[PDB]
Amino acid sequence: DIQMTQSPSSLSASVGDRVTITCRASQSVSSAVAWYQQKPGKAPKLLIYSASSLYSGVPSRFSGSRSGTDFTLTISSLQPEDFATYYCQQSYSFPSTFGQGTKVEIKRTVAAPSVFIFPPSDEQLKSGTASVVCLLNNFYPREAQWKVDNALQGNSQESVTEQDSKDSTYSLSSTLTLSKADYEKHKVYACEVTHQGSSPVTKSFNRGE
Amino acid sequence: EVQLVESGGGLVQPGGSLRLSCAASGFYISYSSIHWVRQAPGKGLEWVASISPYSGSTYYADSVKGRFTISADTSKNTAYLQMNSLRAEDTAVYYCARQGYRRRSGRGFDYWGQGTLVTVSSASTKGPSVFPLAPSGGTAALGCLVKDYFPEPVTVSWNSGALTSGVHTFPAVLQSSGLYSLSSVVTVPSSSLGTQTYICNVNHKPSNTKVDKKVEPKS
RNA sequence: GGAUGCGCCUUGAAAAGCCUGCGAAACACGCAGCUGGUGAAUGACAGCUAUGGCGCAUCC
Ligand SMILES: [Mg+2]
Ligand SMILES: [Mg+2]
């Protein structure tokens, strides 16, 4: 069984940059190595075959190189259309195996999130449950607590979007879940957000409206 | 010109079975190796199985040997993956792929199907409950909460697809309860809250559900 | 599809085995000739033909 260890796992860069991705086979694979590009929700596309040959129709910015058991994919200068996840693959022996991927993201300037808070709808309230949602809109980079009367941390789950195609920012939601009992028992619902943008901003409502 | 169109995905209980199909166009499968590749949600590509031309020799990943069988009906120009005694970790988008012609692309996989989603879970097909996210600088946010549906996927639009700018639909996350939940939001001029109606359209094809929900300021 | 021309490919290595090129071809199956080189078991080839396959151009 042959392993393909791919680095880096992630990378932020800008248009015009040279990007290099490496993949190291644990045993000889004799340049039976291919590289693929995959955008979110889409099938992978072949870029390089036989370690160093350009697949018919992909731009010449893409190149591949082998040094023994070390394989390198190079993009000469990044274009906006080149941000995506890339994968190496060995097909010397069965089973075939893939590298774990490199996510190429676009670098941009820091941007603080705009925060919003939403109370549970009445239709959900009469249902039995009450969920409170906090939105972090159009921020960068990705890194980013609930208080119901200064009670740190029901539990909550967050979801985050991929980089916006237009302005390269992220958005994030955190949804807090309680029973209808515990919803109608404490005064203020506050979402406090901490980011690389100034001082911990907090947003809140109290069920009286 | 060359195309692979997969079908046969869906929801199955652990221990169950499922047959995926891969319909080829623009070439004859008998002259190529056909592969199946897997991508668990948020995870990398994992090779699953392949079948060789002329001999019909088949090959399988360790994770899968003895449970999956790859085959092909040349008269239908279609390859198949029979998946038996399924496990939760078999949940993934399953891709068909053609190994290209040796002289033209070596052993690279030059054409891929669109992918079909297979989810292995005890939970049962359930439509979602869609709840307004009421609004209230000069722009306002509002949205729709899409809770407790199974399995993936659900699609969300706004005003029958007429509202696009500023929309963010977050990826579904699996709550402890074993069902999915996801919010879709949009930012709009607050000045337009009294004069423009905002409805989110939520389609869940697994349950054949289609919902329209108007989002309004609350009194 | 037929006529004409071009480009790439149509393997090297021999008994077996192993490795490599090719045939729509990782396994199984199949792969012409001559010269020179090489082989006290060694891929190590170079040149020129033959045959066929694909592609391009051009005529019907
Ligand atoms: Mg010869
Ligand atoms: Mg020769």
Radius of gyration of chain A (CA): 23
How wide is the angle at C-alpha A174 spanned by C-alphas B115 and B128, nearest 5°?
55
Give whole-number Cα distances, A29 to A33, A86, B152, B183, in Å: 7, 19, 38, 46
Which pair of structure tokens corresponds to residue B98?
Answer: 């053609």
**Domain map (residue ranges) of chain A:** 1-108, 109-209
CATH class of A109-209: mainly beta
- Would you call A56 an interface residue with chain B, using a CB distance cutoff of 8 Å? yes
A147 CB burial (10 A radius; 0-12, 13-18, 19+): middle
Cβ atoms B117, B205 nearer than 8 A: no
Quote the CA–CA distance of B191 and B44 in Å, as a whole number: 45
**Which residue is the nearest neighbor of C27, CA to C1'?**
B57
Does residue B105 sit in helix, strand or coil?
helix
Which pair of structure tokens corresponds to residue A176?
Answer: 């807090």
Which nucleotide is at minimal CA–C1' distance from B31? C24
CATH topology assigned to domain B123-217: Immunoglobulin-like (2.60.40)
Tell me the β-bridge partners of A68: none
Helices and strands per DSSP (H, E), number in chain B: 1, 19
Task: Locate the chain B residue with the closest alpha carbon to A203.
Answer: B136
Cβ atoms A19, A74 nearer than 8 A: yes
Strand C: which positions are within 7 A of a protein CB? Answer: 9, 20, 22-29
**Other C-beta atoms within 10 Å of B181: how many?**
23
Q: Which helix (H) or strand (E) holds A180?
A: helix A180-183
**Do B134 and A121 lie within an 8 Å CB cutoff?**
yes
Cβ atoms B14, B118 nearer than 8 A: no
Backbone torsions φ then ψ of A127, nearest 5 degrees: -75, -30
B18's CB contacts (< 8 A; 6+ apart) are B8, B9, B10, B12, B82, B83, B86, B118
Determine if the peptide bond prior to B41 is cis (ω within 30°).
no
CA of B103 to C1' of C37 (A): 29
**Do B45 and A159 lie within an 8 Å CB cutoff?**
no
User: Which of A36, A136, A170, A207 is closest to B100 using CA atoms?
Assistant: A36
Which pair of structure tokens corresponds to residue B199?
Answer: 């409805």
B194's CB contacts (< 8 A; 6+ apart) are none
**Other C-beta atoms within 10 Å of B108: how many?**
26
Residue type, B33: S
Q: Tell me, in Å, the resolution of the deposited structure.
A: 2.0
Footprint of strand C on the protein (CB under 7 A): A 30, 91-94, 96; B 27-28, 31-33, 50, 52-55, 57, 99-103, 107
Tell me the β-bridge partners of A117: A134
Cβ atoms A180, A129 nearer than 8 A: yes
Cβ atoms A166, A125 nearer than 8 A: no
Experimentally, the structure was elucidated by X-ray
The length of chain A in residues reads: 209
Task: Tell me which residue has tokens 């200068």.
Answer: A77
Cβ atoms A182, A151 nearer than 8 A: no
Task: Tell me which residue has tokens 């054949």.
Answer: B208
CA dihedral of B42, A107, A86, A101, whole degrees rounded to 10: -50
Task: Tell me which residue has tokens 């969920």.
Answer: A131
Buried b (16+ CB within 10 A) or exposed e, B109-135: bbbbbebbbbbbbeeeebbbbbbbbbb
User: Which of B160, B126, B162 is closest to B146 using CA atoms?
Assistant: B126
Does residue A158 sit in helix, strand or coil?
strand
Task: Locate the chain B residue with the closest alpha carbon to A171.
Answer: B168
Q: Where does CATH 2.60.40.10 sit in chain B?
A: 123-217
In A21-148, where does DSSP find H-type helix?
Answer: 122-125
B105 CB burial (10 A radius; 0-12, 13-18, 19+): buried
Going by the DSSP 8-state scheme, the letter that residue B38 receives in this structure is E
CATH class of A1-108: mainly beta
